[PDB]
Every structure is written in structure tokens, then in C-alpha cells.
Amino acid sequence: SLANNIKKSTVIVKDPTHIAICLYYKLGETPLPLVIETGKDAKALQIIKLAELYDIPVIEDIPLARSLYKNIHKGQYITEDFFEPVAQLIRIAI
């Protein structure tokens, strides 16, 4: 469920109108932040529109969104080069 994933997301990082990455982190459940949903083109637009409708935090960070899209697939934990920037994002979001 796309909408359900958006609604549970901790923060969504976007390249405006182009790419959206939904990150999920919960102490005790996720040892590392988890990419739970991704999209490009129309699916990115859908994610961002749902996030706006449901007031889920969205941060514009074009290089991060692009890099996560290329490297961290839906369902995967982030890898080491993303630890700090994604911790930053979760802090801004929370």
C-alpha cells in the first residue's frame, strides 16, 4: 500500500516533481533507517501529493534524493555513505 507507506513514513526526501524517497525509522524496530517506498516521474508526484495531503514531512534535497534512488532500493536499509545525511533529515523531520 502506497498511501499506507507514505502515512507511516518518518520523512520523505524529494527532488521536486521528479523523485521521492520514503524513509522509515523507529527505535527498536529499524536498526538503520529503511527505504520503504520510492518513485520517479508520476509515482514521485503521487508520493509527494499524498505526503502533502497527509502532512508527512517532506524535505527538498535533490542530490540526496537522487543518490538514494540510484542506490537504495525499496525495502532496503540505507548504507554507510547515507548514515549522516539521513540522520540529519530525520532530526529536521522530527
Domain ranges across the chain: 1-94
Q: According to CATH, what is the number of the domain 1-94?
A: 3.40.1690.10
Q: Rounded CA gap, 66 and 28, in Å?
A: 28
Alpha helices in 1-94, H assignment, sequence order: 2-8, 42-53, 62-71, 83-93
This structure was determined by X-ray
In three-state secondary structure terms, 73 is coil
Q: Rounded CA gap, 94 and 92, in Å?
A: 6
- Give this entry's resolution in angstroms: 1.5
Please, are residues 14 and 57 in contact by the beta-carbon 8 Å criterion? no
30-67 in b/e form (b: 16+ CB < 10 A) is eeebbbbbbbeeeebbbbbebbeeeebbbbebeebbbb
Q: Which CA distances in Å does 71 have to 46, 67, 79, 89?
A: 21, 6, 9, 18
In three-state secondary structure terms, 60 is strand
User: Position 54: which residue type?
Assistant: Y
Following CA atoms 71, 75, 77, 82 in sequence, which dihedral angle do they give, to the nearest 10 degrees?
A: 40
